[PDB]
Coordinates of C-alpha atoms in Angstrom, one line a residue:
Chain A
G1 CA 4.6 -2.2 -20.2
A2 CA 3.4 -4.4 -17.3
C3 CA 6.6 -4.0 -15.3
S4 CA 6.1 -0.2 -15.0
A5 CA 2.7 -0.8 -13.2
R6 CA 1.2 -1.3 -9.8
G7 CA 1.3 -5.1 -9.3
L8 CA 4.9 -5.9 -10.4
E9 CA 7.1 -4.2 -7.8
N10 CA 9.9 -6.4 -6.6
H11 CA 9.3 -9.0 -9.3
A12 CA 12.0 -11.3 -10.8
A13 CA 11.0 -10.9 -14.5
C14 CA 11.0 -7.1 -14.1
Chain B
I1 CA 1.9 9.3 -6.6
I2 CA 1.0 11.0 -9.9
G3 CA 0.1 14.6 -9.1
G4 CA -1.0 15.4 -5.6
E5 CA 1.4 17.1 -3.2
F6 CA 4.5 16.5 -1.2
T7 CA 4.1 15.8 2.5
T8 CA 5.9 14.5 5.5
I9 CA 5.4 11.6 7.9
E10 CA 3.5 13.7 10.4
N11 CA 0.5 13.8 8.0
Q12 CA 0.5 10.0 7.6
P13 CA 2.3 8.7 10.7
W14 CA 1.1 5.1 10.2
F15 CA 3.0 5.0 6.9
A16 CA 5.6 2.2 6.7
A17 CA 8.5 2.3 4.2
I18 CA 9.6 -1.3 3.2
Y19 CA 13.0 -2.1 1.7
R20 CA 14.8 -5.2 0.5
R21 CA 18.4 -6.1 1.0
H22 CA 20.3 -7.6 -1.9
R23 CA 23.1 -10.1 -2.1
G24 CA 26.0 -7.7 -2.0
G25 CA 24.2 -5.5 0.5
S26 CA 22.6 -2.6 -1.4
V27 CA 19.1 -1.8 0.0
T28 CA 16.3 -0.7 -2.4
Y29 CA 12.7 0.3 -1.9
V30 CA 9.9 -2.3 -2.3
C31 CA 6.5 -1.0 -1.2
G32 CA 4.5 0.9 1.4
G33 CA 2.6 -0.4 4.4
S34 CA 0.5 0.8 7.3
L35 CA 1.1 0.4 11.0
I36 CA -2.1 -1.2 12.5
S37 CA -0.6 -2.0 15.9
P38 CA 2.8 -1.5 17.5
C39 CA 4.2 -4.9 16.2
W40 CA 2.2 -5.2 12.9
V41 CA 2.4 -3.6 9.5
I42 CA -0.2 -4.4 6.8
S43 CA 0.8 -4.3 3.1
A44 CA 0.2 -6.2 -0.2
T45 CA 1.2 -9.8 -0.9
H46 CA 2.4 -9.0 -4.5
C47 CA 5.2 -6.9 -3.0
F48 CA 6.9 -10.0 -1.5
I49 CA 5.6 -13.0 -3.5
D50 CA 8.7 -13.4 -5.7
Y51 CA 11.2 -13.1 -2.7
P52 CA 9.1 -14.4 0.3
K53 CA 12.1 -14.6 2.7
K54 CA 11.5 -12.4 5.8
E55 CA 15.2 -11.9 6.4
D56 CA 15.4 -10.0 3.1
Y57 CA 13.3 -7.0 4.3
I58 CA 13.8 -3.8 6.4
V59 CA 10.8 -1.7 7.6
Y60 CA 11.1 2.0 8.6
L61 CA 8.5 4.0 10.5
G62 CA 8.6 7.7 11.0
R63 CA 10.4 8.2 7.6
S64 CA 9.6 11.1 5.3
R65 CA 12.4 10.6 2.7
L66 CA 13.3 7.6 0.6
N67 CA 17.2 7.4 0.7
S68 CA 18.0 9.7 3.6
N69 CA 17.3 9.3 7.3
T70 CA 14.4 11.3 9.0
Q71 CA 14.9 12.5 12.5
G72 CA 13.0 10.2 14.9
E73 CA 12.7 7.2 12.6
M74 CA 12.8 3.6 13.7
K75 CA 14.2 0.7 11.8
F76 CA 12.9 -2.9 12.1
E77 CA 13.6 -6.4 11.0
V78 CA 10.7 -8.6 9.9
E79 CA 10.0 -11.3 12.6
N80 CA 7.2 -12.8 10.5
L81 CA 6.0 -12.3 6.9
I82 CA 2.5 -13.5 6.4
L83 CA 1.2 -13.7 2.8
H84 CA -2.4 -14.5 1.9
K85 CA -2.8 -18.2 1.0
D86 CA -5.4 -17.5 -1.6
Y87 CA -3.3 -14.9 -3.5
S88 CA -3.5 -14.9 -7.2
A89 CA -2.7 -12.9 -10.2
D90 CA -3.5 -12.8 -13.9
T91 CA -2.2 -10.3 -16.4
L92 CA -3.8 -7.6 -14.4
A93 CA -5.7 -8.4 -11.2
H94 CA -4.2 -9.4 -8.0
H95 CA -6.7 -11.3 -5.8
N96 CA -6.4 -11.4 -2.0
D97 CA -3.5 -8.9 -2.3
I98 CA -2.9 -8.4 1.4
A99 CA 0.1 -9.2 3.7
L100 CA 1.2 -8.8 7.3
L101 CA 4.6 -8.0 8.6
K102 CA 5.4 -8.5 12.3
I103 CA 8.1 -6.0 13.0
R104 CA 10.9 -6.2 15.6
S105 CA 14.1 -4.1 16.1
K106 CA 17.6 -5.4 16.8
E107 CA 16.8 -4.6 20.5
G108 CA 13.7 -6.8 20.4
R109 CA 11.2 -3.9 20.4
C110 CA 8.1 -2.9 18.3
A111 CA 7.0 0.6 17.3
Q112 CA 7.0 3.3 20.0
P113 CA 4.3 5.9 19.3
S114 CA 5.5 9.5 18.8
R115 CA 4.6 12.6 16.7
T116 CA 5.9 10.7 13.6
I117 CA 4.8 7.1 14.5
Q118 CA 1.1 6.3 15.1
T119 CA -1.3 3.4 14.3
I120 CA -4.3 3.6 11.9
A121 CA -7.7 2.2 12.8
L122 CA -9.2 -0.7 10.8
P123 CA -12.8 -0.3 9.5
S124 CA -15.7 -2.2 11.0
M125 CA -16.7 -5.2 8.8
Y126 CA -18.3 -4.5 5.4
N127 CA -18.4 -0.8 6.3
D128 CA -17.0 1.4 3.5
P129 CA -17.7 5.0 2.5
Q130 CA -20.3 5.7 -0.2
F131 CA -19.1 6.1 -3.8
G132 CA -17.9 9.6 -4.6
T133 CA -16.3 9.9 -1.2
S134 CA -12.9 11.6 -1.2
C135 CA -10.0 9.5 0.3
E136 CA -6.2 10.0 0.7
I137 CA -3.4 7.9 -0.7
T138 CA 0.3 8.1 0.3
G139 CA 3.6 6.8 -0.9
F140 CA 7.0 7.0 -2.5
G141 CA 5.9 5.7 -5.9
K142 CA 6.6 7.3 -9.3
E143 CA 5.4 10.8 -10.1
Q144 CA 5.0 9.9 -13.8
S145 CA 4.4 6.6 -15.5
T146 CA 7.5 7.1 -17.6
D147 CA 9.8 8.0 -14.7
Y148 CA 12.8 5.8 -13.9
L149 CA 13.4 7.3 -10.4
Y150 CA 11.1 7.4 -7.4
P151 CA 10.6 10.8 -5.6
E152 CA 12.9 11.3 -2.6
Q153 CA 10.1 13.0 -0.6
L154 CA 6.9 11.4 0.5
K155 CA 3.8 12.3 -1.5
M156 CA 0.0 12.2 -1.0
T157 CA -3.1 12.9 -3.0
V158 CA -6.9 12.6 -3.0
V159 CA -9.0 10.2 -5.1
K160 CA -12.7 9.5 -5.1
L161 CA -14.3 6.0 -4.5
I162 CA -15.9 4.4 -7.5
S163 CA -18.8 2.0 -7.2
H164 CA -18.3 -1.7 -8.0
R165 CA -21.0 -1.4 -10.6
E166 CA -19.1 1.4 -12.4
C167 CA -15.7 -0.2 -12.1
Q168 CA -17.0 -3.5 -13.5
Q169 CA -18.0 -1.9 -16.8
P170 CA -16.1 -3.2 -19.8
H171 CA -14.4 0.1 -20.6
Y172 CA -13.1 0.2 -17.0
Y173 CA -11.9 -3.3 -15.7
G174 CA -14.8 -5.7 -16.4
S175 CA -14.7 -8.8 -14.2
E176 CA -11.1 -8.3 -13.2
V177 CA -12.5 -6.3 -10.3
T178 CA -14.1 -8.3 -7.4
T179 CA -16.2 -7.3 -4.4
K180 CA -13.0 -7.7 -2.3
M181 CA -11.5 -4.8 -4.2
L182 CA -12.2 -1.0 -4.2
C183 CA -11.7 1.3 -7.2
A184 CA -10.7 5.0 -6.8
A185 CA -9.8 7.7 -9.2
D186 CA -9.7 11.4 -10.0
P187 CA -12.7 12.8 -12.0
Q188 CA -10.1 14.2 -14.5
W189 CA -7.8 11.2 -14.2
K190 CA -5.0 13.6 -13.4
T191 CA -3.8 12.1 -10.0
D192 CA -3.4 8.5 -8.9
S193 CA -1.2 5.9 -7.2
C194 CA 1.6 4.4 -9.4
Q195 CA 4.5 1.8 -9.3
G196 CA 6.1 1.9 -5.9
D197 CA 2.9 3.0 -4.1
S198 CA 1.7 -0.6 -3.8
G199 CA 1.0 -1.8 -0.2
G200 CA 0.4 1.8 1.0
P201 CA -2.7 3.2 2.6
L202 CA -6.0 4.4 1.1
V203 CA -7.4 6.4 4.1
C204 CA -11.0 7.6 4.4
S205 CA -12.9 9.3 7.2
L206 CA -15.6 6.9 8.5
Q207 CA -17.8 7.8 11.5
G208 CA -15.5 10.7 12.2
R209 CA -12.4 8.5 12.3
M210 CA -9.4 8.1 9.9
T211 CA -9.7 4.5 8.7
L212 CA -7.6 2.2 6.5
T213 CA -10.2 1.5 3.8
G214 CA -7.8 0.2 1.2
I215 CA -4.3 -1.1 0.3
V216 CA -2.8 0.0 -3.0
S217 CA -2.8 -3.1 -5.2
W218 CA -3.0 -2.7 -9.0
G219 CA -4.1 -0.8 -12.1
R220 CA -3.6 -0.5 -15.8
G221 CA -1.0 2.3 -16.1
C222 CA -1.3 5.3 -13.8
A223 CA -3.6 8.3 -14.0
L224 CA -5.0 6.9 -17.3
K225 CA -8.5 7.6 -18.6
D226 CA -11.1 4.9 -17.6
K227 CA -8.5 3.0 -15.6
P228 CA -8.9 3.6 -11.8
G229 CA -6.5 2.6 -9.1
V230 CA -7.6 -0.7 -7.5
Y231 CA -7.2 -1.3 -3.8
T232 CA -7.6 -4.3 -1.6
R233 CA -10.9 -3.8 0.3
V234 CA -9.7 -4.0 4.0
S235 CA -13.3 -4.3 5.4
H236 CA -13.6 -7.7 3.7
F237 CA -10.5 -9.2 5.4
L238 CA -11.1 -8.5 9.1
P239 CA -11.2 -12.2 10.1
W240 CA -8.0 -12.9 8.2
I241 CA -6.3 -9.9 9.8
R242 CA -7.5 -10.7 13.4
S243 CA -6.6 -14.4 13.2
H244 CA -3.1 -13.8 11.8
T245 CA -2.3 -10.9 14.3

């Protein structure tokens, strides 16, 4: 998914 | 880092390890960064945008391991957290994905250069290596896309710069890539940055000098065919960097 990618580190949804 | 090799901080002594404190007190890894002067670390805005409070963060320099201390390391609080005002993201691309952390210890001091702690030079404006040039990337990010854990030991690998014209092809990233981004990948797609490497350095040799050419920003998956790593193009942000430092 998107949450396992570069760009979404330290994100609330993930 | 997918593929590549294990390393230690002596081989990338500008590398900054950035962590976040949680309510309750546990500390977890967030992103990489690069020391550009004694008091300033440069990173990616997307690492901080959801929790933009400077008091949440801890920065280590001279650190080769993720959850154990390295001899000679220094720990810093974040005196100022500066995110790029024109930051934006869509499903994939992160625009203006650049951030500055002014670091200060409990004693009121900045980085002291040593064998494990050194600064990295910025490029001159609009000066990047030609496409096909080999550059280095460093970080504590995942070793495989499917991994749950991050590696405990610092890694690095080599990737080759891709031209904007090639990276903008539909089968690569189309218009999601801008002129303020740089693409880089392995010819066999077997090595790449990945989740947890964001904010860290893409370093190239320019005019016989190790230079911070890029900042790990985004990509679709990791080490995936036709999907390069995308890096913030540091040579297009020099006025922003100089003004905010």
